[PDB]
Amino acid sequence: LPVSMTKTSVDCTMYICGDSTECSNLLLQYGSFCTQLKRALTGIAVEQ
Amino acid sequence: ALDPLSETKCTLKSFTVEKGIYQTSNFRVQPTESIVRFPNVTNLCPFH
Numbered sequence: 736l737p738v739s740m741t742k743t744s745v746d747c748t749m750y751i752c753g754d755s756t757e758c759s760n761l762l763l764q765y766g767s768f769c770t771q772l773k774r775a776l777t778g779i780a781v782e783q
Numbered sequence: 784a785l786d787p788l789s790e791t792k793c794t795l796k797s798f799t800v801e802k803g804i805y806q807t808s809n810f811r812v813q814p815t816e817s818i819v820r821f822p823n824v825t826n827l828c829p830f831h
Contacts, residue, residue: 744806746809748809749809754811773806777806
C-alpha cells in the first residue's frame with residue numbers, strides 16, 4: 736500500500752523566468768495566479 | 784526587507800505570526816564579476 740509521494744516545491748519565479756527581471760515583472764502582471772500553486776504544493780507536502 | 788520575522792509577517796500580510804514554519808522567499812547568490820570570452824579572431828569584417 737502506498738503511503739506517500741515525493742514532496743515537491745516548484746517555484747514560480749525561477750521555473751518560469753530564469754533570473755530575468757523583465758520576465759518577472761511581466762509575470763507580476765498575472766496577479767496571484769501562482770501563489771496558489773506554491774500554496775497547493777505546500778499543502779501536498781503537509782498532507783503527505 | 785528588514786528581519787526574517789519581518790519577511791514572514793509580510794508574506795502572510797498579518798501583524799501576528801502564529802507558531803510554525805513559513806516558506807517566505809528564495810535565496811540566490813548574486814554574481815560578483817563576469818567572464819565574457821568570445822573566439823580568438825580580430826580581423827575586421829568588410830562592411831566597408
